[PDB]
Amino acid sequence: MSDPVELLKRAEKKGYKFEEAADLCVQAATIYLKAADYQKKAGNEDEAGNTYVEAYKCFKSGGNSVNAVDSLENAIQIFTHRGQFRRGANFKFELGEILENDLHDYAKAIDCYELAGEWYAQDQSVALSNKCFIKCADLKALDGQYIEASDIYSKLIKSSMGNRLSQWSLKDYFLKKGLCQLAATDAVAAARTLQEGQSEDPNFADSRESNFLKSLIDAVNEGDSEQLSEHCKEFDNFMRLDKWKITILNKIKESIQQQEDDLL
Amino acid sequence: MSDPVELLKRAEKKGYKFEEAADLCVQAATIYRLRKELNLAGDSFLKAADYQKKAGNEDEAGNTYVEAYKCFKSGGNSVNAVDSLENAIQIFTHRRGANFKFELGEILENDLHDYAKAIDCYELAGEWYAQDQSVALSNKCFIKCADLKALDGQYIEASDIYSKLIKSSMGNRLSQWSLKDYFLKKGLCQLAATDAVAAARTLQEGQSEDPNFADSRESNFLKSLIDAVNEGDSEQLSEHCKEFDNFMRLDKWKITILNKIKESIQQQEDDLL
Amino acid sequence: DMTNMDTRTRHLKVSNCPNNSYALANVAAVSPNDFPNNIYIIIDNLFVFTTRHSNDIPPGTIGFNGNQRTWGGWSLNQDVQAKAFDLFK
Structure with missing residues (x-):
């Protein structure tokens, strides 16, 4: 097998010339970004985007999240510039996942998810946009942006209304929105959201989520933090809570405590 | 990025010449799509599709018309989306038509409320799907067609389509419940x-042919409705409807059918005088 | 002496009490530019409180404690109407 270092040196020396350098870089790399840069210089933007996707692929595999993020950014830019917003949205969702899990850059992940959902909506892919908006709303609520998260939940509710397929999602959506x-x-x-959900979706009206949301609304109205805790435990006993709900209700209880501080 | 207006002007000036004009229009339109100006992008795909038709590349014209439909629908322009789907359907049929006819019927039913055209589209889509031996897609199209027809005052035709659905779904383990509802719906129509x-004949046929339907709550409900209409007891029909709702929620289609039935009992009461 | 005082209505924001001592005194803490010192003021024509000069509350704002808000059912940053009060009349 050829020495990848020698191939890279030859590619650099040659860097039609750009195409040959890109081919040499691809060979050396296969033996193991430069090829994509050379392809961009050659005008073959689609090949550059595919090579960037390959760079992202191996960087993610090598644990190098930053280079993976960079490769996804160039690939996304190339694809968006060519009218392939589907590819851009897919890779933006992957980029948001990388940001959220590997780098913990939650704001950029929120931006990526929002953008991916918007482009998916522009492609009429309701379910992928709905997934992206779920991720965006979850991160936004965890990030202190409750109003925006509730707005995204309203968008999810409107998009999923009338679909027999997303019923359960709706049942949760309403709850989550109210929680936010x-x-x-x-x-x-929150009371308005509960009433709208009860009147619009018969399944949600009789759902345990509706009763739990009503109980939480009543508890906040009476300012009984212990009653809210009891309702949370009762809800957990039948339907396990997730970390998102834990955080929302913890901030709510701390808000009751802040109201108690304000009470003095 | 090139100015889409200049590209469209160049395409018009050139409008091989048609192919070049279509490419220029496609470029300007992708730029429009990039700017979220979906309606202008749809108009530019439409111009490119027309030029492609003039060039003899009918398949490319149909694909461009499909893109026009996509962006018009995303842009909220239902009429231009309907037009684009129509040209694409014509191109494809002359050479997909059923898929886009079903989408067109959906657009007509939900966005434009043109229920007759939606019924026609669904019927045609189901017929072509049947010609392709795609039983399930034809069955879905026929469900939509029968639902709209029954809601439109055409009860006999809706019942006939339900009979067709019953015959096509008989013997399939995947569609059992569908049959269970089909019979009911047919009887209701x-x-x-x-x-x-x-309705009694349909109930008997369903009971004797499908064992699942015989013991199903739908069969009992249909028998109760038949008995109530026979005795002319509208209140008994209402009680049966509430009992049926209590265990299995009714849908707006059934609401309308039973409302017209109750109003027919009232009309019979008017004929009683 | 309550004989002379500006009775003009003012719209004031409900804000957090400046500290625990002011809440204990149960006296509406107001700036010198807001109202004179040691006079009775009515709020919403229902809630009467004694004013005390406080430099920590800027003019145009009224401080309340939790019990007063519970009595009036008020939230933070809510706008309330304040006027001079004369119980004797």
Whole structure:
């Protein structure tokens, strides 16, 4: 097998010339970004994007999250510039996943998820956009942006309404939205959301999630933090809570404590 | 990025010449799509598709029309989306038509509320799907067509389509429940047409042919409705409807059918005088 | 002496009490530019409180404690109407 270092040196020396250098770089790399840069210099943007996807692929595999993020960014830019917003959205969702899990850059992950959902909506792919918006709303609520998360949940509710397939999602959506509105101390908005969900979706009206949301609204109205804790334990006993709900209700309880501090 | 307006002007000036004009229009339109100006992008795909038709590349014209439909629908322009789907359907049929006809019927039913055209589209899509031996897609199209037809006052035709659905779904383990509902719906349509005897015949056929339907709650509900219409007890029909709702929630289609049936009992009461 | 005082209505924001001592005194803490010292002021024509000069509360804002808000059902940053009060009349 040829020495990859010698191939890279030959590619650099030659860097039609760009195409040959890119081919040499691809050979050396296969033996093991430069090839994609050379392809861009050659005008073959699609090949550059594919090579960037390959760079992202191996960087993610090598544990190099930063270079993987960079490769995804160049690939996304190339694809978007060529009208392939589908590819851009897929790789933006992957980039947001990388940011959220590997680098913990939650703001950039939120931006990536929002953008991916918007482009998916522009492609009429309701379910992928719905997934991206779920991720975006989850991160936004965890990030202190309760109002925006509730708005995204409203968008999810509107998009999933009338679909027999997303029922369960709706059942949760309403709840989550209300929880966010309750994290923002807007109990009236939470009550409005509960009423809208009860009147619009018969499944949600009789769902345990609706009763739990009503109980939480009542507890915040009476300012009984212990009652809220009891309701949370009762809800956990039948349907396990997730870390998102834990955080929202913890901030809500701390808001009751802040109200108690404000009470003095 | 090139100015899409200049590209469109160049395409118009050139409009091999048609192919070049279509490529220029496609470029300008992708730029528009990149700017989220979906309606202008759809218009530019439409111009490119027209030029492709003039060039003899009908398949490319159909693909471009599909893109026009996509971006018009994303842009909220239902009429231009309908037009684009129509040209694409014509191109494909002359050479997909059923898929896009089903989408067109959906657009007509939800966005434009043109229920007759939606019924026609669904019927045609189901027929072509049947010609392709795709039983399930034809069955879905026929469900939509029968639902709209029954809601449109055409109870006999809806019942006929339900009979077709029953015949196509008989013997398939995957569609059992569908059959269970089909029979019911058919009977309901026959009862909306004041044809209580036909509803009884449908119930008997369903009971004898499909063991699952015989013991199903739908069969008992249909029998109860038939008995209520036979005795002319509208209140008994209402009680049966509430009992049926209590265990299996009714849908708006059934609501309308039974409302017309109750109003028909009231009309019979008017004829009683 | 309550004989002379500006009775003009003012719209004031409900804000957190400046500290625990002011809440204990149960006296509406106001700036010198807001109202004179040691006079009775009514709020919403229902809630009467004694004013005390406080330099920590800027003019145009009224401080309340939790019990007063519970009595009036008020949230933070809510706008309330304040006027001079004369119980004797």
